[PDB]
Amino acid sequence: DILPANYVVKDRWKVLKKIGGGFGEIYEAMDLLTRENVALKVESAQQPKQVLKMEVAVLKKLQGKDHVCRFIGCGRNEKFNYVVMQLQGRNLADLRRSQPRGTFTLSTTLRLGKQILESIEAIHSVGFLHRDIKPSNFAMGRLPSTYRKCYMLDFGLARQYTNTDVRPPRNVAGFRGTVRYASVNAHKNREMGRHDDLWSLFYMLVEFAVGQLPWRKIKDKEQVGMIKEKYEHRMLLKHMPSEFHLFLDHIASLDYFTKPDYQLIMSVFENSMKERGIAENEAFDWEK
Ligand SMILES: CC(C)(O)C#Cc1ccc2[nH]c3c(c2c1)-c1nc(N)ncc1CCC3
Ligand code: NA
Ligand code: NA
Ligand code: NA
């Protein structure tokens, strides 16, 4: 599936360059019909664990939500599976690292948190957990209408948590997401819930504002789990707005079964902005 420059998919999508890879590969391609560039994500037709089909189903389920890429097309063929979707821009991990001290201002952090919370509530509203919420899976828009909006990417680790509602949890479930942002529950092999996506958001926002997490330099997953289990998470909030204590206590109180109080978390962000005079139309840090 290493497609050369000027390769053309279904007589419509002309590959320009590889822009991601691993699971599968991601290409920037030109849509020969609509004449915009698009993101073209491919999965080898021989690779054993085939998840691109569920990624498409979640992406279709989310069409019409904010912070979701447009679905453009998909196809299954003898060599690879693919999905074509709206192309987005810079991801939040790269944007954070390009900041002079590797931190965002509280204005950018809080306003990003509002959008990421909206994204998470959206995928949960269609019956799925993301299970890999992290800053490289959010990308800012690249159009006049979208450049102040971030977009949720990569449903490859998603799991449906409804049956037809809340699905019976497995007694012990394997963890396969990203260690740095994973909740304690994910580390302890508990079946993941909506609250564990919100834990990842909590950790992301602390890292945005403080610039690091205490276990960042430990790559042993089991060690990181024990560190998080023992860590006094209120220490994470020493230089955060005090409303974040509300967010921490809420998600700490949740189990697999209980619907999060997304509105409570949104009000943490909204109240934090009001206390500080932060306005929704402020420049983001990367805007010059
Ligand atoms: C189908 C779905 C929703 O599950 C997915 C996914 C997806 C997984 C991995 C990815 N890596 C990159 C991207 C990406 C997307 C990416 N995607 C888009 N649309 N624009 C720009 C980029 C930036 C280049 C890096
Ligand atoms: Na043109
Ligand atoms: Na861009
Ligand atoms: Na965009």
Swiss-Prot record:
Principal location: cytoplasm
Residues where ATP binds: I19, G20, G21, G22, F23, G24, E25, I26, K41
GO cellular component, one term: perinuclear region of cytoplasm
Signal peptide limits: none
Single Gene Ontology MF annotation: tau protein binding
Residues covered by the Protein kinase domain: 13-273
Tissue expr: Expressed in the brain, particularly in cortical and hippocampal neurons. Weakly expressed in spinal cord and testis. No expression in adipose tissue, bladder, cervix, colon, esophagus, heart, kidney, liver, lung, ovary, placenta, prostate, skeletal muscle, small intestine, spleen, testis, thymus, thyroid or trachea.
Statement: the UniProt record of this protein carries the keyword ATP-binding: yes
Cellular compartments annotated: Cytoplasm
GO BP: learning or memory; negative regulation of gene expression; peptidyl-serine phosphorylation; peptidyl-threonine phosphorylation; peptidyl-tyrosine phosphorylation; positive regulation of astrocyte activation; positive regulation of gene expression; positive regulation of microglial cell activation
S-S bonds: none
Catalytic site: D132
Keywords (A to Z) from UniProt: ATP-binding, Coiled coil, Cytoplasm, Kinase, Nucleotide-binding, Phosphoprotein, Serine/threonine-protein kinase, Transferase
UniProt similarity note: Belongs to the protein kinase superfamily. CK1 Ser/Thr protein kinase family.
Function in brief: Serine/threonine kinase which is able to phosphorylate TAU on serine, threonine and tyrosine residues. Induces aggregation of TAU.
Protein name: Tau-tubulin kinase 1
Protein source organism: Homo sapiens (Human)
Gene giving rise to this polypeptide: TTBK1
Location of this fragment in the whole protein: 22 to 312 of 1321
